[PDB]
């Protein structure tokens, strides 16, 4: 079975160039078409271009022509995307995608890499502060403020509490740092007896905080 | 360039219902080179249909593609829980390949008004020089909702951000959180912090407020 494995997430400064790699295994590399498709936060898929390795024949979307290079190395079955002159609107998950077969190639993209998040920003790595959202039904939560880059994960009570938990998508602040919140609703009658702790993990800063949220 | 139009961008349907998703092209698609993909949050897209009507092995036969020329349709004969997802069309009948903007198939359920909660800044945060005030709109349907911040009755602009959860996999509702941020000094110049919420399920706006310092 064909598997595509991409390089990991990267933060890039505005104006810089990024290279993303895609290593294939399990099929024939040289005679099948490999494309790059990106998806900006909350937006749809956008086709950028592709390469047929055997023929060194590239095909770029006009939007990107002049700013993109796609190359392929048969010796390692790896394809590369270069995107130059990066701007904030280039922040996206970038996927490589290879056409399927019936074998006979089908054009459409049957095989996808796992995606590579490229964040274009001047921000520096920073761990969040975790503040309580202090509490019929009661709501309580945690505000995970001012971190970079994505992602942060949050659990409650070490994963024991999931019913009624809502963890919101991060927002990007004017500072270039992200914030998110996580909330849970619980019985009012439970507030005196039960403990509620939000477990926040931000791997890039090694911020691992367990914040008890009390009335 | 061929422009692919997927309209409507959302369809609210019930489990077990038939779904038909349209893709209309601005000009004839060469050789019916039109594909459909499914995407779930956090995942890469997955190929469902290629060549307008062909299905890869492994893809459920409840998905079927039809059409030709400029008018293509993805039909889902009977929606399963896992079929609530985003669907994209793509044409590859010219060297410049293009995608539609996508259609989200979401679960239809009864209207639920938001339960609204407001949270003053924590003492911890205030000690550091900043004040974030959070408003939560919990467990509502449909997705459309609006929140406005008022501080001593003055409508705020530019000092808040919000986000919305994905549709809940158990009760099919949405939640929304909005955060208002000021410096501590500016927070301390005002008394009443309020959030005002509008939603189909409410016959008039709901306001939650607190007085700073109580």
């Amino acid at each position: 079975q064909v598997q595509l494995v991409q390089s990991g997430a990267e933060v890039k400064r505005p104006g810089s160039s990024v290279t993303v790699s895609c290593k294939a295994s399990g099929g024939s590399f040289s005679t099948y078409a490999l494309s790059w498709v990106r998806q900006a936060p909350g937006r749809g898929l956008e086709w950028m271009g592709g390469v047929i390795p055997l023929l060194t024949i590239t095909n770029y979307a006009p939007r990107f022509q002049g700013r993109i290079t796609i190359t392929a190395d048969r010796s390692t079955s790896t394809a590369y995307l270069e995107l130059n002159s990066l701007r904030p609107e280039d922040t996206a998950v970038y996927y490589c995608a290879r056409e399927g077969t019936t074998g006979k190639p089908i054009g459409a993209f049957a095989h996808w890499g796992q995606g590579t998040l490229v964040t274009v920003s001047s921000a520096s790595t920073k761990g969040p502060s975790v503040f309580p959202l202090a509490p019929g039904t009661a709501a309580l939560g945690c505000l995970v403020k001012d971190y970079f880059p994505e992602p942060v994960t949050v659990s409650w009570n070490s994963g024991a509490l999931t019913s009624g938990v809502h963890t919101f998508p991060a927002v990007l602040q004017s500072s270039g740092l992200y914030s998110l919140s996580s909330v849970v609703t619980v019985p009012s009658s439970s507030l005196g007896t039960q403990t509620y702790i939000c477990n926040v993990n931000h791997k890039p800063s090694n911020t691992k905080v367990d914040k008890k949220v009390e009335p | 360039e061929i422009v692919l139009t997927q309209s409507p961008g959302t369809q609210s349907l019930s489990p077990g219902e038939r779904a038909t998703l349209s893709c209309r092209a601005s000009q004839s698609v060469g050789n019916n080179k039109l594909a459909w993909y499914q995407q779930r949050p956090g995942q890469a897209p997955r190929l469902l249909i290629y060549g307008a009507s062909s299905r890869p092995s492994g893809v459920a036969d409840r998905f079927s593609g039809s059409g030709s020329g400029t008018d293509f349709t993805l039909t889902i004969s009977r929606l399963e829980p896992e079929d609530f997802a985003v669907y994209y069309c793509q044409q590859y009948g010219q060297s410049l390949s293009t995608f539609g903007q996508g259609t989200k198939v979401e679960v239809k359920r009864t209207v639920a008004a938001p339960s609204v909660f407001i949270f003053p800044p924590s003492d911890e945060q205030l000690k550091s020089g900043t004040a974030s005030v959070v408003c939560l709109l919990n467990n509502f349907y449909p997705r459309e909702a609006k929140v406005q911040w008022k501080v001593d009755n003055a409508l705020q602009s530019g000092n808040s951000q919000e986000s919305v959860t994905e549709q809940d996999s158990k009760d099919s509702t949405y939640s929304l959180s909005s955060t208002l941020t000021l410096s501590k000094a500016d927070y301390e110049k005002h008394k009443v912090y309020a959030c005002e919420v509008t939603h189909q399920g409410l016959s008039s706006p709901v306001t939650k407020s607190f007085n700073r310092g109580e």
Binding site: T31, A33, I52, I57, K104, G107 | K33
Partner: peptide, 16 residues
């Protein structure tokens, strides 16, 4: 159509 090239390649590779 660049997207038809690999189909052509497959056919010519099968034949001879």
């Amino acid at each position: 159509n660049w997207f038809d090239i690999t189909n052509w390649l497959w056919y010519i590779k099968k034949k001879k």
